[PDB]
């Protein structure tokens, strides 16, 4: 059944996970990036140095033109383009085909990535944040409305060691995760906003006001690489991680992800870096579960050469809220249960780990006043 969709995401490692799609009639194949952070469907529609192909509206018989321009700014990069519609399909997804809004990307700055092998972007969020407003049914909202696929998808992003994944449209593939699923309510349907109720580093409470963790918002977002924390929370986590891992001294510039750390191949002392835990507001009143990544999720590997492995620190600061990007997701099977307004995590059956540690989802934990953790205005 969903086996057709298992392994349907590829990625040039550190350049984002993408699912192949076709656009228009006849169907021009394009690799689209999977992004739960954005809510806009958009494909490169005019040449650019970085992308080896693009969308030629001229050659698509099913292509209409909406006669309105669009501007989208990402935390990293931005583009502007022309809004069309056209027939969309997914080879290693459901054998269905919809008319869905498409943004033809005709101008961009620091968006496309060199070597990334993607050429477009699939914003999977909700319409509330679509650009230029909520009258632009996001691709998925249409896919469900126009077909029989149920309102739900799940993502298993698979990291590399010393890249691949699966986006399951409409269902849950039980072969991709181990143990139970645990669900946190989606706080509001715009981003996939969740509420973190406690943070631990190697088990040590960060001991900050619950609000500070969701300061602005905390969202799940496959498009972002790092785990991104609000400043007070970042500076706090860097101290605690520095503390624990202090078995080795470190350039001030490493924690800013400006410098890389290197060891003779394989001799990477994983055991000295702390695990990180996020507790999430659970489905049941006054209850909560935690999720725990390893150094192997927050130390993204980077291909200097030689017989040495090098890693970049993938926890960075953020002015706009927590962002649980690939660093977190690379450790779990994440189920975006749009239907039941909730999100589930389960230990991804393909998360990099070592002999002595592994990523974890675990619960429940008695937590009170969790509703008190969400920020406002």
């Amino acid at each position: 059944s969903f086996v057709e969709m298992v392994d349907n995401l590829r990625g040039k490692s550190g350049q984002g996970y993408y699912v192949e799609m076709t656009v228009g009639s006849p169907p021009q194949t394009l690799n689209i990036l999977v992004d739960t952070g954005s809510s806009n469907f958009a494909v490169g529609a005019a040449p650019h140095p970085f992308l080896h192909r693009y969308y030629q509206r001229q050659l698509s018989s099913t292509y209409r033109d909406l006669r309105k321009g669009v501007y989208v700014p990402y935390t990293q990069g931005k583009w502007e383009g022309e809004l069309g519609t056209d027939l969309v399909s997914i080879p290693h997804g459901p054998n269905v085909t919809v008319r869905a809004n498409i943004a033809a990307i005709t101008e961009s700055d620091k968006f496309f990535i060199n070597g990334s092998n993607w050429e477009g972007i699939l914003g999977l969020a909700y319409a509330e944040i679509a650009r230029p407003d909520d009258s632009l049914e996001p691709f998925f909202d249409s896919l469900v409305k126009q077909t029989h696929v149920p309102n739900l998808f799940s993502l298993q992003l698979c990291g590399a060691g010393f890249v691949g994944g699966s986006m399951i449209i409409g269902g849950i593939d039980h072969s991709l995760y181990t143990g139970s699923l645990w669900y946190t309510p989606i706080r509001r349907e715009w981003y996939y906003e969740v509420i973190i109720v406690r943070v631990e580093i190697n088990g040590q409470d960060l001991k900050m006001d619950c609000k500070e963790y969701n300061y602005d918002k905390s969202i799940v977002d496959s498009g972002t690489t790092n785990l991104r924390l609000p400043k007070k929370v970042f500076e706090a986590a860097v101290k605690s991680i520095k503390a624990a891992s202090s078995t080795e001294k470190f350039p001030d510039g490493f924690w800013l992800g400006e410098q890389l750390v290197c060891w003779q191949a394989g001799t990477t002392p994983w055991n000295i870096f702390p695990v990180i835990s996020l507790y999430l507001m659970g489905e049941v009143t006054n209850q909560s579960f935690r999720i725990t990544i390893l150094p192997q999720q927050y130390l993204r590997p980077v291909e200097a050469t030689s017989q040495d492995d090098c890693y970049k620190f993938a926890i960075s600061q953020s002015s706009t809220g927590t962002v649980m990007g690939a660093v977190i997701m690379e450790g779990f099977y994440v189920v975006f249960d749009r239907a039941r307004k909730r999100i589930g995590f389960a230990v991804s059956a393909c998360h990099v780990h070592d002999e002595f540690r592994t990523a974890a989802v675990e619960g429940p934990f008695v937590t009170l006043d969790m509703e008190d953790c969400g920020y406002n205005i």
């Binding site: 992004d35 739960t36 952070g37 954005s38 809510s39 700014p73 972007i121 972002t224």
Partner: peptide, 5 residues
């Protein structure tokens, strides 16, 4: 990836 809201 969105910035602003």
């Amino acid at each position: 990836f969105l910035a602003x809201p």
